Ligand binder design. Structure first.
Ligand code: AJT
Ligand code: PRO
Length: 491
């Protein structure tokens, strides 16, 4: 029992998340705060979604590349609105060994200024457009807020795409094309539902025209979290970096640029969504070992021979599996050993050999059933798909039951204290965002996230807008509201 999870997911969600990521061999802690080690089980998930996202962006003619880790002061402060948001979190290298550098250099929090410093040399005519680039790297944002593995780290793996188009229509089209790819990223591989929306003016990317987002929600602690982002930068970065091109009428024009990113935070959202009191729970598309086979003891040689036959037919069908034949541990140990590591299927094998069958157990609901030997391949093929849809449909229902539509403010704190979001009519005035955050944080006297702010913030203006009444006013200012917006506590 001590080798398993000792904290229930409902009781202590913070301690539960720490035990799950450690005992499943996903995360190892480090002697630098905010930095964590991705063990092979965690990095394998990253390679899976990386192989999917690569194949999809090649269809859009996006090409991979790598740009330097460092940036000078001259290039970093080109755009005013972009550096003002990143300035206190930018890490600076100031010396080599014991000798100071002739000029200080900064570690990339994002590669806008690094990549766009050389775009004018690549973009000179309309023939050089569209320019589409992507990187798979890490960036460093040295914040002093409470770190959490995967989702809130000072260094994080991600991809960052950067495109440049001839007009606004072509760039905005790619923004929402990428945004839907992020939806397939979370749905088809992590089984996590998301909400597409537009960020408010006070929550959009520095130097961007608008920011499209994919929002997720953690229902155990009532915290939303941005799953991915896709910005339409317009001509803002093109003006400060002088990224011009001569059009087909011999007139100089600014390019319409986009930037979009999705990090390993996607892995943490998956853990908080499907993890249970038994440990990690993994969708099949991001799990290395699909099935685990545990013997139960007469004739020991007959059980070893029978268990290896299932591992043979499973590996023949391109389904990687593992047979835990460790004689130093009981089956009960092996049961909890792989349930903590998120193995989707366990096949248990003396009476089963006499019946020429085996006990196939699911990880999501622990539903066991007898399956004959010759009919175990097809039964395990479909159970993988059924486990993936069950994890997504259950997560979709918990997401739907998390949004509460409100028309005033006297019903907002009740929904927040119920671990819910709120869909309220809003005038979208940027001045009201700080007013709502300060007031909701003041009224938050009953939380127990001691490291997360009790304030609620504008999450996103959902693309799926419900009908708007003619005289519906703003829930905060009372002015004529414009659209519905999602508010709530976030990561
Ligand atoms: O951001 C991260 N770390 C920071 C450093 C640190 C250090 C300690 C504690 C917190 C943080 C925070 C991050 N970390 C691990 C994995 N992924 C990450 N990023 C993302 O998932 N990204 C997509 C959402 C983007 N959100 C915004 O730009 C905000 C939201 C609206 C207004 N602007 C950020 C990029
Ligand atoms: O950090 C961001 O939000 C944008 C998107 C990826 C590159 N820069």
């Amino acid at each position: 029992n001590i080798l398993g999870i000792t904290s229930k997911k409902i009781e202590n969600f913070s301690d539960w998340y720490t035990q799950v990521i450690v005992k499943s061999e996903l995360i190892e802690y480090y002697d630098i705060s905010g930095c964590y080690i991705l063990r092979p089980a965690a990095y394998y998930i990253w390679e899976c979604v990386q192989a999917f996202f690569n194949k999809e962006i090649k269809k859009l003619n996006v090409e991979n590349s790598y740009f330097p880790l460092f940036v000078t002061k001259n290039k970093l402060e080109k755009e005013k609105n972009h550096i003002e948001g990143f300035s206190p979190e930018v890490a600076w290298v100031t010396k080599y060994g014991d000798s100071n550098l002739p000029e200080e250099i900064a570690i990339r929090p994002t590669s806008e200024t690094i990549m766009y410093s050389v775009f004018p040399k690549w973009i000179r005519s309309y023939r050089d457009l569209p320019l589409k680039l992507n990187q798979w790297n890490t960036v460093v944002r040295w914040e002093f807020k409470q770190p959490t593995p995967f989702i809130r780290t000072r260094e994080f793996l991600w991809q960052e795409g950067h495109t440049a188009h001839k007009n606004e229509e072509e760039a905005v089209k790619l923004v929402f094309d990428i945004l839907d790819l992020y939806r397939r990223w979370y749905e088809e591989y992590l089984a996590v539902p998301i909400i597409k929306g537009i960020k408010s003016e006070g929550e959009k990317f520095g130097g961007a025209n608008f920011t499209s987002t994919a929002e997720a929600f953690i229902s155990e602690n009532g915290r939303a979290i941005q799953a991915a982002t896709s910005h339409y930068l317009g001509t803002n970065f093109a003006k400060m970096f002088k990224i011009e091109f001569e059009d087909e009428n011999e007139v100089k024009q600014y390019v319409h640029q986009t930037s979009w990113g999705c990090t390993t935070r996607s892995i943490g959202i998956m853990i908080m969504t499907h993890g249970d009191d038994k440990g990690l729970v993994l969708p099949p598309n991001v799990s290395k070992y699909k099935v685990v086979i545990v013997p139960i003891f007469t004739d020991e040689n007959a059980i070893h021979s029978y268990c290896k036959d299932i591992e043979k037919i499973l590996k023949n069908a391109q389904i990687n599996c593992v047979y835990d034949d460790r004689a130093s541990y009981s089956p009960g140990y092996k049961f909890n050993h792989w349930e903590l590591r998120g193995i989707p299927i366990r096949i248990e094998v003396p009476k089963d050999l006499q019946n020429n069958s085996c006990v196939i157990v699911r990880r999501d609901n622990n539903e066991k059933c007898n399956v004959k030997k010759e009919s175990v391949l097809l039964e395990t093929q479909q159970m993988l798909v059924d486990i993936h849809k069950n994890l997504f449909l259950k997560a979709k229902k918990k997401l739907d039951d998390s949004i509460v539509q409100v028309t005033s403010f006297s019903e907002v704190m009740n929904a927040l204290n119920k671990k819910k979001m709120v869909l309220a009519p809003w005038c979208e005035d940027i001045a009201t965002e700080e007013e709502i955050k300060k007031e909701t944080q003041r009224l938050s006297l009953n939380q127990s996230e001691t490291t997360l702010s009790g304030a609620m913030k504008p999450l996103c203006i959902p693309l799926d807008q419900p009908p708007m009444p003619p005289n519906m006013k703003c829930f905060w200012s009372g002015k004529p509201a414009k659209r519905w917006c999602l508010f709530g506590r976030s990561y």
